[PDB]
PDB file of C-alpha atoms in Angstrom:
ATOM      1  CA  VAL A   1     -72.082-167.902 -63.945  1.00  0.00           C
ATOM      2  CA  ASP A   2     -72.674-170.348 -66.841  1.00  0.00           C
ATOM      3  CA  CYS A   3     -71.290-173.889 -66.517  1.00  0.00           C
ATOM      4  CA  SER A   4     -72.243-175.093 -69.981  1.00  0.00           C
ATOM      5  CA  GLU A   5     -68.565-175.261 -71.076  1.00  0.00           C
ATOM      6  CA  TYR A   6     -67.667-177.703 -68.296  1.00  0.00           C
ATOM      7  CA  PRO A   7     -66.290-179.874 -67.159  1.00  0.00           C
ATOM      8  CA  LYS A   8     -62.681-178.805 -67.515  1.00  0.00           C
ATOM      9  CA  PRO A   9     -59.710-181.038 -66.795  1.00  0.00           C
ATOM     10  CA  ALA A  10     -57.976-178.360 -64.761  1.00  0.00           C
ATOM     11  CA  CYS A  11     -58.636-175.089 -63.002  1.00  0.00           C
ATOM     12  CA  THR A  12     -56.402-172.145 -62.131  1.00  0.00           C
ATOM     13  CA  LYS A  13     -56.256-171.531 -58.383  1.00  0.00           C
ATOM     14  CA  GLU A  14     -57.034-167.894 -57.733  1.00  0.00           C
ATOM     15  CA  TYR A  15     -59.537-167.245 -54.887  1.00  0.00           C
ATOM     16  CA  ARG A  16     -62.831-165.520 -55.866  1.00  0.00           C
ATOM     17  CA  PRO A  17     -65.475-167.341 -53.853  1.00  0.00           C
ATOM     18  CA  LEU A  18     -68.994-168.444 -54.823  1.00  0.00           C
ATOM     19  CA  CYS A  19     -71.605-169.930 -52.467  1.00  0.00           C
ATOM     20  CA  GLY A  20     -73.261-173.165 -53.613  1.00  0.00           C
ATOM     21  CA  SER A  21     -76.752-174.495 -52.802  1.00  0.00           C
ATOM     22  CA  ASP A  22     -74.972-177.125 -50.640  1.00  0.00           C
ATOM     23  CA  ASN A  23     -73.775-174.337 -48.326  1.00  0.00           C
ATOM     24  CA  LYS A  24     -70.210-174.909 -49.432  1.00  0.00           C
ATOM     25  CA  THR A  25     -68.053-171.998 -50.446  1.00  0.00           C
ATOM     26  CA  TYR A  26     -66.383-172.853 -53.800  1.00  0.00           C
ATOM     27  CA  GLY A  27     -62.956-171.171 -54.244  1.00  0.00           C
ATOM     28  CA  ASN A  28     -63.601-169.994 -57.804  1.00  0.00           C
ATOM     29  CA  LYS A  29     -65.904-170.335 -60.750  1.00  0.00           C
ATOM     30  CA  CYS A  30     -63.960-173.199 -62.348  1.00  0.00           C
ATOM     31  CA  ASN A  31     -64.103-175.253 -59.131  1.00  0.00           C
ATOM     32  CA  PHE A  32     -67.813-174.468 -58.733  1.00  0.00           C
ATOM     33  CA  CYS A  33     -68.758-175.382 -62.316  1.00  0.00           C
ATOM     34  CA  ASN A  34     -66.817-178.660 -62.203  1.00  0.00           C
ATOM     35  CA  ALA A  35     -68.740-179.570 -59.030  1.00  0.00           C
ATOM     36  CA  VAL A  36     -72.020-178.656 -60.781  1.00  0.00           C
ATOM     37  CA  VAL A  37     -71.119-181.125 -63.537  1.00  0.00           C
ATOM     38  CA  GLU A  38     -70.082-183.747 -61.005  1.00  0.00           C
ATOM     39  CA  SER A  39     -73.490-183.409 -59.321  1.00  0.00           C
ATOM     40  CA  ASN A  40     -75.143-184.062 -62.647  1.00  0.00           C
ATOM     41  CA  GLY A  41     -76.661-180.558 -62.588  1.00  0.00           C
ATOM     42  CA  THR A  42     -78.151-180.722 -59.081  1.00  0.00           C
ATOM     43  CA  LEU A  43     -75.867-178.139 -57.452  1.00  0.00           C
ATOM     44  CA  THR A  44     -76.845-174.505 -58.085  1.00  0.00           C
ATOM     45  CA  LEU A  45     -75.522-171.021 -57.274  1.00  0.00           C
ATOM     46  CA  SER A  46     -76.778-169.481 -54.056  1.00  0.00           C
ATOM     47  CA  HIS A  47     -74.912-166.135 -54.165  1.00  0.00           C
ATOM     48  CA  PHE A  48     -71.526-164.643 -55.001  1.00  0.00           C
ATOM     49  CA  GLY A  49     -68.982-164.539 -52.216  1.00  0.00           C
ATOM     50  CA  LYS A  50     -68.553-166.773 -49.163  1.00  0.00           C
ATOM     51  CA  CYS A  51     -71.435-168.815 -47.740  1.00  0.00           C
TER      52      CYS A  51
ATOM     53  CA  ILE B   1     -43.727-161.032 -46.354  1.00  0.00           C
ATOM     54  CA  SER B   2     -42.448-164.304 -47.825  1.00  0.00           C
ATOM     55  CA  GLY B   3     -43.139-167.012 -50.432  1.00  0.00           C
ATOM     56  CA  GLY B   4     -46.580-168.594 -49.926  1.00  0.00           C
ATOM     57  CA  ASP B   5     -48.157-165.603 -48.140  1.00  0.00           C
ATOM     58  CA  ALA B   6     -51.457-164.119 -49.396  1.00  0.00           C
ATOM     59  CA  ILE B   7     -51.557-161.317 -51.917  1.00  0.00           C
ATOM     60  CA  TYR B   8     -54.673-159.422 -52.912  1.00  0.00           C
ATOM     61  CA  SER B   9     -55.491-157.742 -56.177  1.00  0.00           C
ATOM     62  CA  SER B  10     -58.661-155.854 -56.992  1.00  0.00           C
ATOM     63  CA  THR B  11     -60.166-159.064 -58.247  1.00  0.00           C
ATOM     64  CA  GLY B  12     -59.144-161.783 -55.735  1.00  0.00           C
ATOM     65  CA  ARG B  13     -56.445-163.440 -53.707  1.00  0.00           C
ATOM     66  CA  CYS B  14     -53.407-165.386 -54.850  1.00  0.00           C
ATOM     67  CA  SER B  15     -50.121-166.315 -53.221  1.00  0.00           C
ATOM     68  CA  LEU B  16     -46.677-164.710 -53.416  1.00  0.00           C
ATOM     69  CA  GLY B  17     -44.206-166.954 -55.308  1.00  0.00           C
ATOM     70  CA  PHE B  18     -40.680-165.861 -54.574  1.00  0.00           C
ATOM     71  CA  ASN B  19     -39.107-162.510 -53.660  1.00  0.00           C
ATOM     72  CA  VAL B  20     -36.540-161.655 -56.365  1.00  0.00           C
ATOM     73  CA  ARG B  21     -34.288-158.774 -57.303  1.00  0.00           C
ATOM     74  CA  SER B  22     -32.400-157.023 -60.043  1.00  0.00           C
ATOM     75  CA  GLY B  23     -29.640-154.621 -59.003  1.00  0.00           C
ATOM     76  CA  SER B  24     -31.324-152.787 -56.138  1.00  0.00           C
ATOM     77  CA  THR B  25     -34.891-153.219 -57.455  1.00  0.00           C
ATOM     78  CA  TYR B  26     -37.054-155.684 -55.530  1.00  0.00           C
ATOM     79  CA  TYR B  27     -39.960-157.596 -57.026  1.00  0.00           C
ATOM     80  CA  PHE B  28     -41.990-160.705 -56.384  1.00  0.00           C
ATOM     81  CA  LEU B  29     -43.068-163.417 -58.758  1.00  0.00           C
ATOM     82  CA  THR B  30     -46.538-164.912 -58.876  1.00  0.00           C
ATOM     83  CA  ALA B  31     -48.829-166.612 -61.404  1.00  0.00           C
ATOM     84  CA  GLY B  32     -49.467-164.850 -64.711  1.00  0.00           C
ATOM     85  CA  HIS B  33     -53.206-165.575 -64.440  1.00  0.00           C
ATOM     86  CA  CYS B  34     -53.163-163.547 -61.172  1.00  0.00           C
ATOM     87  CA  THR B  35     -51.213-160.580 -62.647  1.00  0.00           C
ATOM     88  CA  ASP B  36     -53.384-160.556 -65.775  1.00  0.00           C
ATOM     89  CA  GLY B  37     -55.569-157.441 -65.535  1.00  0.00           C
ATOM     90  CA  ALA B  38     -54.253-156.593 -62.021  1.00  0.00           C
ATOM     91  CA  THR B  39     -52.526-153.345 -61.303  1.00  0.00           C
ATOM     92  CA  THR B  40     -52.030-152.835 -57.594  1.00  0.00           C
ATOM     93  CA  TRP B  41     -51.364-155.528 -54.985  1.00  0.00           C
ATOM     94  CA  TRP B  42     -52.040-155.428 -51.263  1.00  0.00           C
ATOM     95  CA  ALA B  43     -50.848-157.535 -48.330  1.00  0.00           C
ATOM     96  CA  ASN B  44     -54.314-157.743 -46.701  1.00  0.00           C
ATOM     97  CA  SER B  45     -58.019-158.163 -47.490  1.00  0.00           C
ATOM     98  CA  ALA B  46     -58.659-154.690 -46.128  1.00  0.00           C
ATOM     99  CA  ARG B  47     -56.324-153.279 -48.796  1.00  0.00           C
ATOM    100  CA  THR B  48     -54.565-151.111 -46.320  1.00  0.00           C
ATOM    101  CA  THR B  49     -50.995-152.321 -46.814  1.00  0.00           C
ATOM    102  CA  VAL B  50     -49.789-151.773 -50.357  1.00  0.00           C
ATOM    103  CA  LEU B  51     -47.193-154.158 -51.757  1.00  0.00           C
ATOM    104  CA  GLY B  52     -46.548-152.844 -55.270  1.00  0.00           C
ATOM    105  CA  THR B  53     -47.672-152.776 -58.885  1.00  0.00           C
ATOM    106  CA  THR B  54     -47.686-155.339 -61.666  1.00  0.00           C
ATOM    107  CA  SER B  55     -44.623-154.933 -63.969  1.00  0.00           C
ATOM    108  CA  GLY B  56     -45.148-157.894 -66.246  1.00  0.00           C
ATOM    109  CA  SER B  57     -47.582-160.655 -66.990  1.00  0.00           C
ATOM    110  CA  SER B  58     -47.354-163.717 -69.192  1.00  0.00           C
ATOM    111  CA  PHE B  59     -50.483-165.917 -69.504  1.00  0.00           C
ATOM    112  CA  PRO B  60     -51.700-167.946 -71.177  1.00  0.00           C
ATOM    113  CA  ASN B  61     -48.923-169.989 -73.034  1.00  0.00           C
ATOM    114  CA  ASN B  62     -46.746-169.403 -69.969  1.00  0.00           C
ATOM    115  CA  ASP B  63     -48.001-168.744 -66.395  1.00  0.00           C
ATOM    116  CA  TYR B  64     -45.871-166.137 -64.617  1.00  0.00           C
ATOM    117  CA  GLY B  65     -46.065-162.468 -63.668  1.00  0.00           C
ATOM    118  CA  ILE B  66     -43.923-160.051 -61.702  1.00  0.00           C
ATOM    119  CA  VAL B  67     -44.807-157.217 -59.324  1.00  0.00           C
ATOM    120  CA  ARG B  68     -42.546-154.345 -58.421  1.00  0.00           C
ATOM    121  CA  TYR B  69     -42.484-153.524 -54.742  1.00  0.00           C
ATOM    122  CA  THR B  70     -43.497-149.914 -53.958  1.00  0.00           C
ATOM    123  CA  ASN B  71     -43.798-150.465 -50.181  1.00  0.00           C
ATOM    124  CA  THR B  72     -40.568-149.266 -48.607  1.00  0.00           C
ATOM    125  CA  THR B  73     -40.980-150.487 -45.026  1.00  0.00           C
ATOM    126  CA  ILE B  74     -42.297-154.048 -45.468  1.00  0.00           C
ATOM    127  CA  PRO B  75     -39.736-156.812 -44.973  1.00  0.00           C
ATOM    128  CA  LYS B  76     -39.025-158.792 -48.141  1.00  0.00           C
ATOM    129  CA  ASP B  77     -37.646-162.150 -46.984  1.00  0.00           C
ATOM    130  CA  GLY B  78     -35.825-164.370 -49.484  1.00  0.00           C
ATOM    131  CA  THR B  79     -37.622-167.358 -47.916  1.00  0.00           C
ATOM    132  CA  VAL B  80     -40.714-169.527 -48.208  1.00  0.00           C
ATOM    133  CA  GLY B  81     -42.326-169.274 -44.819  1.00  0.00           C
ATOM    134  CA  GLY B  82     -39.181-169.724 -42.760  1.00  0.00           C
ATOM    135  CA  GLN B  83     -37.337-171.850 -45.333  1.00  0.00           C
ATOM    136  CA  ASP B  84     -34.368-170.131 -46.929  1.00  0.00           C
ATOM    137  CA  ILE B  85     -34.123-170.179 -50.711  1.00  0.00           C
ATOM    138  CA  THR B  86     -30.596-169.875 -52.122  1.00  0.00           C
ATOM    139  CA  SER B  87     -30.861-170.898 -55.748  1.00  0.00           C
ATOM    140  CA  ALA B  88     -33.119-171.912 -58.586  1.00  0.00           C
ATOM    141  CA  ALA B  89     -33.049-175.289 -60.300  1.00  0.00           C
ATOM    142  CA  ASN B  90     -34.685-177.324 -63.032  1.00  0.00           C
ATOM    143  CA  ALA B  91     -37.314-179.847 -62.087  1.00  0.00           C
ATOM    144  CA  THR B  92     -36.639-183.504 -62.859  1.00  0.00           C
ATOM    145  CA  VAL B  93     -38.984-186.534 -62.843  1.00  0.00           C
ATOM    146  CA  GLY B  94     -38.979-188.133 -59.342  1.00  0.00           C
ATOM    147  CA  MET B  95     -37.813-184.987 -57.612  1.00  0.00           C
ATOM    148  CA  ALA B  96     -39.196-184.458 -54.096  1.00  0.00           C
ATOM    149  CA  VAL B  97     -40.884-181.045 -53.961  1.00  0.00           C
ATOM    150  CA  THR B  98     -42.851-178.853 -51.551  1.00  0.00           C
ATOM    151  CA  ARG B  99     -45.533-176.228 -52.233  1.00  0.00           C
ATOM    152  CA  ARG B 100     -46.699-173.437 -49.911  1.00  0.00           C
ATOM    153  CA  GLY B 101     -49.902-171.491 -50.533  1.00  0.00           C
ATOM    154  CA  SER B 102     -52.110-168.973 -48.771  1.00  0.00           C
ATOM    155  CA  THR B 103     -55.115-171.309 -48.494  1.00  0.00           C
ATOM    156  CA  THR B 104     -53.661-174.747 -47.821  1.00  0.00           C
ATOM    157  CA  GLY B 105     -50.307-174.000 -46.299  1.00  0.00           C
ATOM    158  CA  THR B 106     -47.460-176.450 -46.979  1.00  0.00           C
ATOM    159  CA  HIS B 107     -47.863-179.772 -48.846  1.00  0.00           C
ATOM    160  CA  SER B 108     -45.269-182.126 -50.319  1.00  0.00           C
ATOM    161  CA  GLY B 109     -45.000-184.616 -53.159  1.00  0.00           C
ATOM    162  CA  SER B 110     -43.030-185.496 -56.270  1.00  0.00           C
ATOM    163  CA  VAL B 111     -42.594-184.307 -59.846  1.00  0.00           C
ATOM    164  CA  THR B 112     -44.328-186.885 -62.055  1.00  0.00           C
ATOM    165  CA  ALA B 113     -43.810-185.419 -65.537  1.00  0.00           C
ATOM    166  CA  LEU B 114     -42.354-182.444 -67.404  1.00  0.00           C
ATOM    167  CA  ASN B 115     -43.332-180.310 -70.386  1.00  0.00           C
ATOM    168  CA  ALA B 116     -47.046-180.904 -69.806  1.00  0.00           C
ATOM    169  CA  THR B 117     -49.747-179.021 -71.712  1.00  0.00           C
ATOM    170  CA  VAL B 118     -52.670-177.765 -69.600  1.00  0.00           C
ATOM    171  CA  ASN B 119     -55.863-176.512 -71.234  1.00  0.00           C
ATOM    172  CA  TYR B 120     -57.817-174.209 -68.892  1.00  0.00           C
ATOM    173  CA  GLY B 121     -60.361-173.692 -71.637  1.00  0.00           C
ATOM    174  CA  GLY B 122     -61.568-170.719 -73.656  1.00  0.00           C
ATOM    175  CA  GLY B 123     -58.202-170.634 -75.429  1.00  0.00           C
ATOM    176  CA  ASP B 124     -56.216-170.427 -72.190  1.00  0.00           C
ATOM    177  CA  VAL B 125     -53.666-173.126 -72.917  1.00  0.00           C
ATOM    178  CA  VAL B 126     -50.327-173.249 -71.074  1.00  0.00           C
ATOM    179  CA  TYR B 127     -47.342-175.286 -72.208  1.00  0.00           C
ATOM    180  CA  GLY B 128     -44.140-176.730 -70.742  1.00  0.00           C
ATOM    181  CA  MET B 129     -45.567-177.262 -67.296  1.00  0.00           C
ATOM    182  CA  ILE B 130     -44.244-179.409 -64.453  1.00  0.00           C
ATOM    183  CA  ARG B 131     -46.793-182.045 -63.336  1.00  0.00           C
ATOM    184  CA  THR B 132     -46.779-183.227 -59.701  1.00  0.00           C
ATOM    185  CA  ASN B 133     -48.963-185.195 -57.288  1.00  0.00           C
ATOM    186  CA  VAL B 134     -49.127-182.241 -54.847  1.00  0.00           C
ATOM    187  CA  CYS B 135     -52.605-180.855 -54.077  1.00  0.00           C
ATOM    188  CA  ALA B 136     -53.578-177.169 -54.325  1.00  0.00           C
ATOM    189  CA  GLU B 137     -56.779-175.207 -53.749  1.00  0.00           C
ATOM    190  CA  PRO B 138     -58.170-171.777 -54.736  1.00  0.00           C
ATOM    191  CA  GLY B 139     -55.962-169.076 -53.298  1.00  0.00           C
ATOM    192  CA  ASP B 140     -52.826-171.175 -53.738  1.00  0.00           C
ATOM    193  CA  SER B 141     -52.140-169.850 -57.300  1.00  0.00           C
ATOM    194  CA  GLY B 142     -48.673-168.316 -57.680  1.00  0.00           C
ATOM    195  CA  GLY B 143     -47.247-169.904 -54.552  1.00  0.00           C
ATOM    196  CA  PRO B 144     -43.750-171.418 -54.650  1.00  0.00           C
ATOM    197  CA  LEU B 145     -42.754-174.981 -55.451  1.00  0.00           C
ATOM    198  CA  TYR B 146     -39.369-175.644 -53.920  1.00  0.00           C
ATOM    199  CA  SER B 147     -37.020-178.491 -53.028  1.00  0.00           C
ATOM    200  CA  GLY B 148     -34.774-177.979 -50.062  1.00  0.00           C
ATOM    201  CA  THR B 149     -33.280-174.483 -50.595  1.00  0.00           C
ATOM    202  CA  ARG B 150     -33.956-174.585 -54.355  1.00  0.00           C
ATOM    203  CA  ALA B 151     -36.677-172.611 -56.091  1.00  0.00           C
ATOM    204  CA  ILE B 152     -38.425-174.812 -58.670  1.00  0.00           C
ATOM    205  CA  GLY B 153     -41.746-173.353 -59.826  1.00  0.00           C
ATOM    206  CA  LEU B 154     -44.940-171.298 -59.384  1.00  0.00           C
ATOM    207  CA  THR B 155     -48.377-172.816 -58.799  1.00  0.00           C
ATOM    208  CA  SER B 156     -50.573-172.579 -61.903  1.00  0.00           C
ATOM    209  CA  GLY B 157     -53.512-174.954 -61.484  1.00  0.00           C
ATOM    210  CA  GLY B 158     -54.757-178.526 -61.509  1.00  0.00           C
ATOM    211  CA  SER B 159     -57.556-180.635 -60.119  1.00  0.00           C
ATOM    212  CA  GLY B 160     -58.680-182.383 -56.989  1.00  0.00           C
ATOM    213  CA  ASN B 161     -58.118-181.039 -53.502  1.00  0.00           C
ATOM    214  CA  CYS B 162     -55.956-181.610 -50.463  1.00  0.00           C
ATOM    215  CA  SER B 163     -58.433-183.880 -48.708  1.00  0.00           C
ATOM    216  CA  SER B 164     -58.878-186.420 -51.471  1.00  0.00           C
ATOM    217  CA  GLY B 165     -55.579-185.733 -53.233  1.00  0.00           C
ATOM    218  CA  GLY B 166     -54.952-183.989 -56.522  1.00  0.00           C
ATOM    219  CA  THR B 167     -52.669-183.114 -59.423  1.00  0.00           C
ATOM    220  CA  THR B 168     -51.045-179.671 -59.688  1.00  0.00           C
ATOM    221  CA  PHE B 169     -49.158-178.070 -62.549  1.00  0.00           C
ATOM    222  CA  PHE B 170     -46.391-175.542 -62.005  1.00  0.00           C
ATOM    223  CA  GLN B 171     -44.596-172.998 -64.201  1.00  0.00           C
ATOM    224  CA  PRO B 172     -40.783-173.557 -64.138  1.00  0.00           C
ATOM    225  CA  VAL B 173     -39.349-170.639 -62.207  1.00  0.00           C
ATOM    226  CA  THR B 174     -36.144-170.592 -64.268  1.00  0.00           C
ATOM    227  CA  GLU B 175     -38.054-169.405 -67.303  1.00  0.00           C
ATOM    228  CA  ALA B 176     -39.490-166.510 -65.313  1.00  0.00           C
ATOM    229  CA  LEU B 177     -36.159-165.488 -63.796  1.00  0.00           C
ATOM    230  CA  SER B 178     -34.670-165.417 -67.270  1.00  0.00           C
ATOM    231  CA  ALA B 179     -37.514-163.451 -68.833  1.00  0.00           C
ATOM    232  CA  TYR B 180     -37.237-160.665 -66.247  1.00  0.00           C
ATOM    233  CA  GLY B 181     -33.490-160.708 -65.655  1.00  0.00           C
ATOM    234  CA  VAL B 182     -33.975-161.200 -61.924  1.00  0.00           C
ATOM    235  CA  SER B 183     -32.668-163.619 -59.375  1.00  0.00           C
ATOM    236  CA  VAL B 184     -33.636-165.187 -56.089  1.00  0.00           C
ATOM    237  CA  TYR B 185     -31.911-164.105 -52.932  1.00  0.00           C
TER     238      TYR B 185
END
């Protein structure tokens, strides 16, 4: 997962979970990458799938 | 199975839009971005109950897809959860609407604009969308947007979440019904 193209103003809402370094399961890549941007690059990917 | 219930592809989970039919052939509508590259659909995460196979998909530009039921025994309710759907209608600014999805359940709000352009990036731009102040979260894609007993649209995407509030864009269902020559029931 590469978030360099973010942020994006909108995301589609399919469910394909990713687990963030904050222990939160992000619903999809777009949601995860937008949160990475919002954290000013502090949030990272833990693993693919649910936390 | 009814509008708003979970549907699983090989890639992920979305929500069933509306059950529709043509002659004696039953299908269900969902988001195009969910049907894109999907062949078979199941009713559960275990992939043990087959629903059907993708018959059409339109995304980006539009955001709708249709799946032909192949499961003969499964009930195909013409409802959204328990709510009966009897017709389809065009969205209007200020219209009170309700969305049901497999992750967040049922949430309500209003239509705040029409013919909106949504850029999902990488060339995935969709046009003519209904904008609302209803929230939606991953898994809710394809779920129905309705108003009373009227079918209005299919969940495409947006931003925010249900806790803080958000903005969600929907594909007008009329366009999809017309494209596939099907109707709600």
